[PDB]
């Protein structure tokens, strides 16, 4: 991929005679000015603040945990929603079978970021004459901030006029990576929803884990057992791997998604649902009024505007 007119005389001689040497990335030539204020010590250790300009400890790292890098990864996330790896769980019609809307799931998957936990209360009434066909009405998401495993949402449950005809099916949450089981954070969130929200019934509650699989997503329907629900509600170990969890704490759910029923979507009337960029509002005393609006961008100009102040 070189230019023949750009070759020098000795270059042509070396081309004809033998070969030429390459240069790998491991070969390093470690052989404008930006001032930086640092809290240092002087020669006597006097704890001073200095402003240096020598570029010798200025190499930025910026790997896998930056807002810029995370946003760049979130770019083209819509192109990653093609191979939707659905999970055919072993739920032999325990209760209302999962019949979700394809458009709502597609919109929610392409509107979430794969860095923090993004979730939402997926509620909806069953269709007409639904013996084992639950209704995936729509997912309402209020402002919240999510960790690498579980996402923290507002304390108060949703309550809207369009939600009067809808029953709370469960809560959906997108894990960072793939895992063949419910996480301790997911179990804790399910237990909290069952204890606080009366609409989070035992058999009527679900967990649609829309985790990020390799290349595509992974939508796994799960549910919590009574004893498992109690253990996850009382489990104070809110880490990635708490102590006091058993495989019976969660079970799979047999459900599918189709595009026949155009589902709804509960958006925030005041601020954007994705509030991870501004972690000064996702508290337990959040009592916000939702609205009939589509979810906002995970890294939109209004999702995390504080970075643009610079």
């Amino acid at each position: 991929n070189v230019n023949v007119a750009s070759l020098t005389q000795s270059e042509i001689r070396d081309i004809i005679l033998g070969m030429e040497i390459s240069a790998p990335s491991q070969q390093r030539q470690q052989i404008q000015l930006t001032a930086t204020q640092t809290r240092t010590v002087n020669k006597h250790g006097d704890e001073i603040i200095t402003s240096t300009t020598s570029n010798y400890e200025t190499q930025t790292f910026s790997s896998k945990t930056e807002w810029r890098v995370r946003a760049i990864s979130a770019a083209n996330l819509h192109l990653r929603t093609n191979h939707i790896y659905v999970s055919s769980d072993d739920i032999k019609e325990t209760g209302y079978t999962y019949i979700l809307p394809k458009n709502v799931l597609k919109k929610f998957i392409c509107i979430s970021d794969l860095r923090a936990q993004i979730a939402g209360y997926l509620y909806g009434v069953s269709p007409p004459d639904n013996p084992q066909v639950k209704e995936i009405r729509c997912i309402v998401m209020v402002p919240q901030w999510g960790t690498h495993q579980t996402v923290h949402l507002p304390g108060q449950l949703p309550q809207h006029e369009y939600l009067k005809e809808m029953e709370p099916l469960g809560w959906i949450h997108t894990q960072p990576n793939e895992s063949p089981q419910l996480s301790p954070q997911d179990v804790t969130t399910h237990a909290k929803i069952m204890a606080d929200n009366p609409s989070w019934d035992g058999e009527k509650t679900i967990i649609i884990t829309c985790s990020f699989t390799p290349g595509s997503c992974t939508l796994t329907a799960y549910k919590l057992t009574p004893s498992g629900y109690e253990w996850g509600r009382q489990n104070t170990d809110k880490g990635n791997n708490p102590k006091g969890y058993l495989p019976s704490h969660y079970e799979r759910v047999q459900m599918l998604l189709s595009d026949r029923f155009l589902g709804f979507f509960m958006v925030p009337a005041q601020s954007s649902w994705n509030y991870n960029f501004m972690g000064v509002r996702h508290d337990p005393n959040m009592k916000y009024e939702l609205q009939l609006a589509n979810p906002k961008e995970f890294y939109h100009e209004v999702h995390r505007p504080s970075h643009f102040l610079n």
Partner: protein, 184 residues
């Protein structure tokens, strides 16, 4: 200079009053941040303001010789040389204890043996708890009477070598001080 003794000052104990603090510790105070930020242009009015904000007493701490704000204020008064009765107003305060101990330490460094005993022996009746910073940087709970006992008995208080007090019984046998009447 920010650290020159005021040119309307006495010569306490035959020397520059700032010299009542050891020279190494004097220099360490002079290069501290608390002395350059919070102890510049201070009068005896503002030494009170800084004194009411003191949270502990102590000398120096750490592997480096880092003065406490208490010791910095002591050196600042040694520089200013406030009048004696200003120091009595310092000591006679009963609400802010650290102001009282700061005045007591200045009196111990500055006052004669008669003044030291007469003004610091009444402070044996104060038993309020206080923070004192160790040499390792930790904080210990002492009492005001223990601090006054260290002032009147120990050679070194707050890592300052104190001017040598005449023993009490010598002044008592000279009739210059009536015996120490306690509260008991």
């Amino acid at each position: 200079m920010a650290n020159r003794t005021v040119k309307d000052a006495h010569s306490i104990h035959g020397t520059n009053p700032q010299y009542l603090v050891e020279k190494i510790i004097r220099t360490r105070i002079y290069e501290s941040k608390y002395w350059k930020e919070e102890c510049f242009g201070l009068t005896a009015e503002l030494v009170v303001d800084k004194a009411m904000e003191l949270r502990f007493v102590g000398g120096v701490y750490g592997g480096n010789i880092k003065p406490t704000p208490f010791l910095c204020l002591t050196l600042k008064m040694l520089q200013i040389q406030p009048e004696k009765d200003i120091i009595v107003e310092f000591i006679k305060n009963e609400d802010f204890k650290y102001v009282r101990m700061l005045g007591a330490l200045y009196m111990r460094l500055t006052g004669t043996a008669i003044d030291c005993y007469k003004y610091l022996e009444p402070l044996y009746n104060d038993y309020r708890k206080i923070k004192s910073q160790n040499r390792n940087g930790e904080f210990e709970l002492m009492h005001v009477d223990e601090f006054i006992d260290e002032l009147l008995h120990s050679e070194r208080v707050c890592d300052i070598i104190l001017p040598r007090l005449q023993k009490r019984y010598v002044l008592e046998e000279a009739e210059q001080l009536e015996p120490r009447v306690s509260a008991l």
